[PDB]
Symmetry: D2
Subunit: 116 residues, 4 copies
């Protein structure tokens, strides 16, 4: 799979498990079209969102549902979600890992981009 | 002002100057309505976006034009922009600082909410 | 003052108040000599650590007592402390801000070096 | 192995490869005794530093040689290194991943602690 999402919890020192993730792709009319969704596993990783064939060039938005995560654990966090928006595959196919480290009032995110 | 935005550059160890920032408020029909905007100053800060009277409870989005910032430095970045989405609550402390720390392939954001 | 330390709490979205900070300078024999210390204020900031005359070029260590901070909040943290080690250079901008953002199992640190 | 170190580069969007790492353990006389060392692989990971038998209770310091990393790439960074100091195994053996995300004037670090 050319798109993976990994989420860690900076309060517990653990993977962030069961985090809902929704991916969108910008359509020709400039709207966000639903593309794929899933939830992180016990390792904090979400695999299998898409395929090389379906992950064409485009502008993608990876929405990480951080508020639902913290609220499911009884914490009242600051952000509604974390959004990661990027152009993908504009120089040919690449593999993308979108990582995020969560705290109730802060998050970090980075990307690892590799050429298969 | 109840809302301030600060942007820092982790590559050069400096404020991120002249970064465009747009603030939106979520409307009843679930669309994003323009609310306020500006460019960060020489200190990386953007003051005066709004007033206590105008900054009512609701859901707000702060969009930071990180791509244009890096492109002006001759660096090709990963993200189209950085977006910070949050609910303003009256119960909470009154003043909101939204800080972002930028690298070409990474950003962090935190909220400092105080009296 | 050429050196300021700022500490923020990512769990509560607030300054980290009353955090002990110790600064050391590396001596010729490679040991760490005490240089300055204090506690962060209600704004999470520690000002007045040193002067331009005293802050000569060299290697400095800023140790932030993060463990005591979390323990006072009833939270068990991972790190013994956070340490920031850097060289002061005269060529560079004059004023150094060392910022740290704290969570129980994580911290970030950045330097803002300006004129 | 119960201790792993992973390092990423936030400028390049890639693993941080060939980063030197030195681990120390506080001795009874309060000095930092050398414990293990190595360098990150092409994946940004450093495996095999120690064993369950030799990784006893103690206070450990993981020194990540960030300045040498950036300088080997011709960048002049702010920090001399990144130091991660923690008590390990005080409630029995655990597995520790020490992660770090590097920029020239900033770094983040987190831990993932699991119970085998
Ligand atoms: C002021 C500041 C410092 C750091 N830092 O790295 O020390 C940060 O990460 C952030 N932030 O927004 O996440 C803000
Ligand atoms: C910083 C970081 C740490 C871990 N980690 O395992 O702690 C990761 O897996 C990743 N990543 O990209 O997948 C990044
Ligand atoms: Na192209
Ligand atoms: Na014990």
């Amino acid at each position: 799979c050319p798109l993976m999402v990994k989420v860690l919890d900076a309060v517990r020192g653990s993977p962030a498990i069961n985090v809902a993730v929704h991916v969108f792709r910008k359509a020709a009319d400039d709207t966000w079209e639903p593309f794929a969704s899933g939830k992180t596993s016990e390792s904090g990783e979400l695999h299998g969102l898409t395929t090389e064939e379906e992950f064409v060039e485009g502008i993608y938005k990876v929405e990480i549902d951080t508020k639902s995560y913290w609220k499911a654990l009884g914490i009242s966090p600051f952000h509604e979600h974390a959004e990661v928006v990027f152009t993908a595959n504009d120089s040919g196919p690449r593999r993308y890992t979108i990582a995020a480290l969560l705290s109730p009032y802060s998050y970090s995110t980075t990307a690892v981009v590799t050429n298969p």
